[PDB]
Design a protein around this ligand. Sequence first.
Ligand SMILES: Cc1nc(C)c(C(=O)Nc2ccc(F)c(-c3nc4ncc(-c5ncccc5C)cn4n3)c2)o1
Ligand SMILES: Cc1nc(C)c(C(=O)Nc2ccc(F)c(-c3nc4ncc(-c5ncccc5C)cn4n3)c2)o1
Ligand SMILES: *[B]([O])([O])[C]([C][C]([C])[C])[N]C(=O)[C]([C]C1=[C][C]=[C][C]=[C]1)[N]C(=O)C1=[C]N=[C][C]=N1
Ligand SMILES: *[B]([O])([O])[C]([C][C]([C])[C])[N]C(=O)[C]([C]C1=[C][C]=[C][C]=[C]1)[N]C(=O)C1=[C]N=[C][C]=N1
Lengths: 214, 240, 204, 130, 206, 206, 201, 201
Amino acid sequence: WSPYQDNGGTTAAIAGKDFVILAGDTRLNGDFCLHSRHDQSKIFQLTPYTYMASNGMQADRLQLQQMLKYRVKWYKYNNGGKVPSTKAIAQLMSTMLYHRRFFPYYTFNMVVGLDEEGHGVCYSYDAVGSTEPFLYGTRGSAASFVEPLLDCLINRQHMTSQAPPEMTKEETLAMLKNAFTGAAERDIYTGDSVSFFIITKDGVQQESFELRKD
Amino acid sequence: SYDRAITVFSPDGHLFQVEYAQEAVKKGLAAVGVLGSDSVVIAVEKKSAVKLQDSRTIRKIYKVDANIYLAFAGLSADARVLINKAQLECQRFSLNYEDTMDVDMLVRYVAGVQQKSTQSGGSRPFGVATVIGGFNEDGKPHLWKTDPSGMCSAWRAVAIGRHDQTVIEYMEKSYKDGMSRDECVHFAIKSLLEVVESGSRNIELLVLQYKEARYLTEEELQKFVVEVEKEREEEAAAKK
Amino acid sequence: SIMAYSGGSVMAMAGKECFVIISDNRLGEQLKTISTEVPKLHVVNDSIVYGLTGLRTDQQTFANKVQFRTEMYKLREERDITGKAFAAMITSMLYEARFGPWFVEPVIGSIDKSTGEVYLCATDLIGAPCEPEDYVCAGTAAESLHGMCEALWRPGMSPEELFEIAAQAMLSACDRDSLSGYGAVAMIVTKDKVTTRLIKGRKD
Amino acid sequence: GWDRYYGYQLYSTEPSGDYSAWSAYAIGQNDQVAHALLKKDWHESMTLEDGMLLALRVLGKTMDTAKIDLDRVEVAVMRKVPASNIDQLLDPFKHHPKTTPRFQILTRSELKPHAERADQAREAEEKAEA
Amino acid sequence: MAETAIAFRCKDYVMVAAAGLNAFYYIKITDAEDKITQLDTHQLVACTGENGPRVNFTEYIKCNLALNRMRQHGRHSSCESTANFMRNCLASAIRSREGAYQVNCLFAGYDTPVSEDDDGVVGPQLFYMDYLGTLQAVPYGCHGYGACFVTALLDRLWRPDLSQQEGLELMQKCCDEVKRRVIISNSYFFVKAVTKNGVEVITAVH
Amino acid sequence: MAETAIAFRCKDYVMVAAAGLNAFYYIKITDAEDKITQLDTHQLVACTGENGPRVNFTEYIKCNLALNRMRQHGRHSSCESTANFMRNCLASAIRSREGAYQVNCLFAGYDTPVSEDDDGVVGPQLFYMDYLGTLQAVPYGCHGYGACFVTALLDRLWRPDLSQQEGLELMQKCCDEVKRRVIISNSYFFVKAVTKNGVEVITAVH
Amino acid sequence: TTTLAFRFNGGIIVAVDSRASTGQYIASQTVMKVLEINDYLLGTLAGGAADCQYWERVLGMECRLWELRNGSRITVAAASKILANITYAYRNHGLSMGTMVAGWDQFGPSLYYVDDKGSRVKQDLFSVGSGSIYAYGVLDTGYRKDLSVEDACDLARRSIFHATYRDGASGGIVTVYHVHEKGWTKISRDDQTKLYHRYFP
Amino acid sequence: TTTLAFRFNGGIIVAVDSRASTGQYIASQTVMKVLEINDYLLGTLAGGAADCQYWERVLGMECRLWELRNGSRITVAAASKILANITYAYRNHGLSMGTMVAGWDQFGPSLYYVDDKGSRVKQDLFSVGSGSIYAYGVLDTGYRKDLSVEDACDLARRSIFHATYRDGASGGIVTVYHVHEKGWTKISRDDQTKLYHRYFP
Ligand SMILES: Cc1nc(C)c(C(=O)Nc2ccc(F)c(-c3nc4ncc(-c5ncccc5C)cn4n3)c2)o1
Ligand SMILES: Cc1nc(C)c(C(=O)Nc2ccc(F)c(-c3nc4ncc(-c5ncccc5C)cn4n3)c2)o1
Ligand SMILES: *[B]([O])([O])[C]([C][C]([C])[C])[N]C(=O)[C]([C]C1=[C][C]=[C][C]=[C]1)[N]C(=O)C1=[C]N=[C][C]=N1
Ligand SMILES: *[B]([O])([O])[C]([C][C]([C])[C])[N]C(=O)[C]([C]C1=[C][C]=[C][C]=[C]1)[N]C(=O)C1=[C]N=[C][C]=N1
């Protein structure tokens, strides 16, 4: 018996000027079977402006989502109802991944939220909490498909051409569908349906999208 | 274990076990220290010339650090336990920080131990008051004073022990700021023989300089007492 | 192995009204000589002399705990420790640390001052008591000493002729062992006197 | 006891944690009396036979007894004897000192030559009283 | 073991020498790092090993000798009392949680009479030690890779009646042999000496 | 790997340098052993490795170049034909009974026109090799522990138009860096050079 | 990682890359490998990414608590001894971190170096990381104590570059700092690919 | 086993011990560490006792068959190359032997050394075995090329002795040979215990 197990799936996020698009496919799978196709336990809401979006092991995912859930509640009780920012949550994430360094979580995390200025910033983590603010991020089994793809079309590097204007919410969303329709073709542990979260200052809207079932 | 609350409050907001620990210091031997420009002197009472005491001369002012020395007043058994906590703290400091300990750091530790015994179960306060003097790594002479309540404060001329207020109100109207070395030893003698009897074998004075500490012997102390004894005759002649 | 790290062999024989004890002079680290003038014997009183072999770090640490316990025995009980009480004392010390065991093998020789009975004892590293009436031996050359001591011993020996057998048994066994040698230091002891002799050996 | 740091030492111990070094001291009944009698005659360059005769003579003063009795007096001396248990052969690189200190307690055969010198010294200061 | 320590005692001095090399698996960090820690005014120790346990063992030994001089009114303890305090820290660490100190050291000192009643040792002291807790008083001791080159050199040339200059040119032969056969580049050797007037840092032999 | 080989080619010469250290696990056997084998009058190879396979590989290569000059009437083959014959012996030995050669080598040479119909290479040749059978023509190649110290040194200072003296003082900087950072004592470096007049043993840089 | 730093007549210059690779995959390219401890200290990063960012944030907490209690700045001889006692305490716990501290205390400059095993050394010239062996040969050739401020910034920026060019675990954006008596200033911040067409046009 | 041989102005002096130990038990004390190959060559033995005595008996057969076919003596450069090609052929077969060949051919002397892995080196000064590291430091201190015949016999007998005194795997009876132009002569054969009361009376 081994107490670690990879449950597939991928999560990707692209942050804009006053928004973040956050996505993650709904597909749970085990040893060689397919457990489910409708797991919503991959992206978790902490505050109305900051989400966490983790994947890897499904059992240690649900435990990390709850300990993150109540450290926000002790923050809210001890500060007079003040909701924590993205920078406060993502440093809370970076410490708790190191407090369990010798029996760690088999999760790979992304804290996704808005700034105090309103701009969206995504963070990424290893298994022990190496953080960095960055404009996008892709974790999971299909990370090596999508993270070079997001390098080629967001940074606009190695292309002798002038810069396009700033990406809207719609042109970011239609871009991010081209990655999950690309990861459903070439990765066997990825893709039944991907759920898009659009975090704006006037609440969050939620969409769904269909991928290949095989 | 036994941890019943001993140091409690009075119906007038006083701590009885602290006010009664200060009374044990007011019967202790008087110790006077003044602050100069390049030197620190501290003089203690050194109970008597017992003639039965050992010919090996016993120091009253104890060494705590290389540059920080300490003199106390109160119960001599409580003060020995207090200093072996402070002598253990200097070797905790230069094992975790690779530095010589400042004078203001050691006094905040000893005052932290005095206050910690005033808020424990089964513990009475320490019945000692200390005068701590020493230099930093950059010169800067210092002189400190802790009470049994645990309050640290740095002074320009300090006196503890029996007749606490008697010396301090005397040497706040005769203190000259920025003395030399020979003026400090002369000023510590004339403040200490105000309280102790006129004997010459019951003063133990010490001069602190930078990386050089010199205890005064028998015959060197005879030179400074006579210069004080001839001047206090002039001070009485100035009154009449 | 850890037991043959430092080198050194200690043995003892029993005579009529006397016993001998003899160690070598070598200290080492598995092939190389660290010192050439180091005995392994220890004397606690005028009746008991014991020798330690094994790991030299444990040869000094255990002998400090023995001297801590032998001198505390003389303060509590107003008397010198006897041979049967000393051998049963450090038998118990090697059994308390049975899972973290000391790497010593004490070779105890003792005698009664008033009666004249010799008492030999050689425990293992885990404290196994064993009292032969003829001889005891421990160390790296211990397998060579059971041949030398058993083919040369007889029960009725004088103190002068028991030394001659124990000395030729130590040296002939250390000429076949490459972790023991460099002379030998012996100690014959009767009811009346203690004589300590240093013996010529090969400097190889 | 003797150490190599300051030689022969003598200490008191109070039931409060306080101690003090001394050259002569008294604890028990009439310790305030026996301090003054030791203060009247103690000098630096004093031998052990002059110190043991000082020790027995002040002991008879407090319990007001001429002809000091040996059944009611216990003595013990702390001096250095020549070292006998030196074993240079099993310790080749260890140095042994020449003389070692030995705490001992005198018997009745050892204290009778010293108790008959303290009453005579009391008798020597008795013929010159009037 | 890559760095050697060489020490020999004579009639009125103890020479020590320790190569000041510090490396990172093949990369020379330093060439002049002092590895002979001055414990007391008449005592020093030449520890070898990696730089992790070597500082943390010597600072624990040095601050406890100084603490035992604070609590004992500035009375300097003997060299055997310091050496037996050292191997107590080696022997209690091989049976502990944190593990054994990987330090090999040579203790050196000179015994002076602290008072007129002291009739102890007058001569010099030199103690071989180990990482396990072995302690041995020895005429000369050596650690490192080049130890076996120079221990048999001191079998040939060491004499108990060597002078300050004759033992100074012996240590120069001790340093030139390690430069000749050992593949590890030991170029600067930090020669110090303990005499009746304290320690002294010899500039000539390097 | 304990011994370094440094080689760089320029407009009309190829410098080589190989430390002449031979050791037995920490004991310096030699300090002057020639490790740059003169294969032909215009070709040489600077092999590194232990002394077992290093002689037996170079003697097999050298005696077969000489045999191919016996059977072909003294006609000297090109430097690429020798280098491709060498890596055939490395690559066929990693899949054999006796095992792989543990030799790392730098081939060097100068191409001269053997007749009037030869219109091949005129310039110098320098080939990096490996123990597996990797072959790469390179502007400068380095082996050993100190290779990474000096390959980034030649990233800084090497120029294609260096002269005989300017590349001679560059190789002196190459030898002084290995003495400065590598713990392995490389003191004598055997600098040779291949020019249009054959090989030459440079005495100055050591 | 190819962090280096050296000490000269005029202060201390710290120079890093910005690349974090988890083997043969490059995780990131904008990693800050200098955690400024406060406005007069610096700390560097090599080895494990989480082991460095945790304990130099612990080190930045013990330096701030020093100034609150004692009212004065912490020295660098006390700052590394905090980091070395932490590191030696966890030497059997498999940590991987190699960090330099650099700062201007009241005794001038000092450039220390702490292992993951409790070592602390005091020199004027270091280069740490997997590609540091490339950064020594170009730095030891051109180092001298009395360099100017501009030439030592040029020697540091050029010595990072020749190791980023050769090591697979090094590269990105070369960041050069300068520790003078008033604190530290970020000198330059430039890409390694842009820096290739300056040094070899 | 401690075994050395050196080259000087006057020939080659070979000096050995005579001890064979199986770990901590000493098997024998009269082992001839020098196998004379013929009346102008020598060969020493170190490492495995059977691996040396076999292949230096094979080497003594290939040197005798050389003289039968070619009518002349074999050189030392051909004699070691026979032993080195044998040794390199069995480098994966776990052999343990380290041997020096020494002799006077028509080109003066030459002193070689063959591993168990196929190496062959040409120097003037060797010391092989487990206790060789003790025999270097007393020999490198007192070696020079123009020693006399008696002093170089004294330096070899004294350098073996300080290795037998310190190493547990070396000892016995120090055997000193001398290779001059007419062949070899057994100089001395003396016990190590008798040799202690000569050098330290
Ligand atoms: C004074 C001094 N002189 C030198 C030469 C040094 C030094 O090098 N000290 C040092 C200490 C601890 C470390 F942990 C490291 C260190 N740095 C690294 N950088 C990158 C990778 C790595 N990265 C990606 C993939 C794979 C690997 C192996 C690994 N390490 N390990 C370096 O110190
Ligand atoms: C040019 C040169 N420089 C040096 C320093 C050498 C050298 O040392 N070459 C060498 C080669 C092959 C060997 F096999 C040996 C060799 N000698 C030995 N003697 C004794 C024991 C032994 N004995 C008893 C018990 C246990 C052991 C391990 C083992 N060995 N192994 C030595 O060559
Ligand atoms: B430098 O290259 O060492 C750099 C270190 C810096 C960010 C503190 N990063 C890395 O290369 C390390 C390599 C490594 C060393 C030791 C163990 C494991 C990895 N990479 C990371 O730590 C890493 C891995 N994945 C994500 C983020 N960081
Ligand atoms: B000397 O110690 O190297 C000696 C030289 C030999 C020519 C007599 N060798 C031995 O003593 C070896 C030691 C050894 C080395 C390597 C592997 C195993 C053993 N011993 C023997 O070969 C041996 C075994 N049994 C009897 C006699 N000799």
